[PDB]
Design a binder for this molecule. Sequence first.
Ligand code: 3K7
Length: 462
Amino acid sequence: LLRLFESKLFDISMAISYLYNSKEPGVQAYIGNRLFCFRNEDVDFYLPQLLNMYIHMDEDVGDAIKPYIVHRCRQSINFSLQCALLLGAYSSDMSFSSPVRLAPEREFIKSLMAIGKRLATLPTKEQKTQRLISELSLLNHKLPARVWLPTAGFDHHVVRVPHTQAVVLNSKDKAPYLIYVEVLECENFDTTSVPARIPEWQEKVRRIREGSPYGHLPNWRLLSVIVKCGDDLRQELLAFQVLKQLQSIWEQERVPLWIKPYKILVISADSGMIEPVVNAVSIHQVKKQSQLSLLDYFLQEHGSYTTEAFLSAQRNFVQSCAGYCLVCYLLQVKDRHNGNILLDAEGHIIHIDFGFILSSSPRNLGFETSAFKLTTEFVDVMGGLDGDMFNYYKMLMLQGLIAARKHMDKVVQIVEIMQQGSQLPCFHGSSTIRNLKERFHMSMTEEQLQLLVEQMVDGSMR
Ligand SMILES: COc1ccc(-c2c(C)nc3c(N)cc(Cl)nn23)cc1OC
């Protein structure tokens, strides 16, 4: 990057950029020393990009990043966990500060994933659930301990697992399972000590709490996760990064677009944990259960046409649908079906299963392509092709596309970096980044962008 950054900014994304892109002899180390000057929480986002740069890139870059992580690994234990896991997952084809530091955690995770790997023999989901709880009952024996769910945005200890409420999501061999976990918040996980056991919609929080020994605690907080033992979440993690970025961007420029990136934890190349969305539901399931048109569902659940509940509902619907049309466009998300889109109790829609994105396309699939489509049933919810909020939809898409163009470097950066030494389908040659850049359309005028958006909408409906 041409040295010549002397014309100062200076920004964390851009610093990463100078670290990745720069061929100058002195700058890699410089940035390496400038990372310390940054808000730790800001740096922790690009973490998977640092290690993948650490792993697959030059010794200059390696030795450049190297001191920062050690500074932090000493500083934060969860950070260390992350560094380890990601060091294991992202290299293919290429009582703390003691060695027992992470052992309880390692064994916790190992347990959960083993449990998940044991379900294969049992064909049908119900059997799997029963066996699951039967095996899952055993952890509270060893609990509490020094253990935490990195998913949580707070330091904590896992003191209990309400085993009875565990469920299994599907009948496959690699089929995931959802669990609920009772934890108690600390101020600092490193300083604070381990509490002591007590052996005796989402209101599940309640009915668990009142049914829990540690329930009475003011610290007490419930968490939930999805343990996928046979699945590779690295791609999906990339999706998480991108989504989070676009969220930040759209927040900055004050565009109403609503998307909810859900957290991702990559434990291994075949393993990982996801943080579930609450109160949202499959939208296929709505069609099945309700036996109602999506609109009619909106009219059943929230109010009627003039009811503020309805208006808010479909407004959030529109904004959401828009944000995700844009996301799906840029990121070239595929494999969209009702199974992949949820609907929250507030009336948003939430996409999942990001496994197929960018250059990654599903097999089979003769002559039908699996992509975001605006169903008639959707428009019916919004309005109609001529409808008061449809123009709002399109306008929103336009605005978001603009702001995206503005911040494009930040978004492309993540991907471009994570392309290094990857075995993943999403990366195909230099095609991926190219097509992405061209997907931002920096050469277009907002009128041509309005046109484009007209083409995108028209192209969705068919
Ligand atoms: C198969 O793998 C997955 C299974 C479930 C979810 C997920 C999340 C993060 N939130 C929800 C939710 N609220 C409902 C359902 Cl059914 N799934 N789900 C995401 C997955 O990643 C692809």
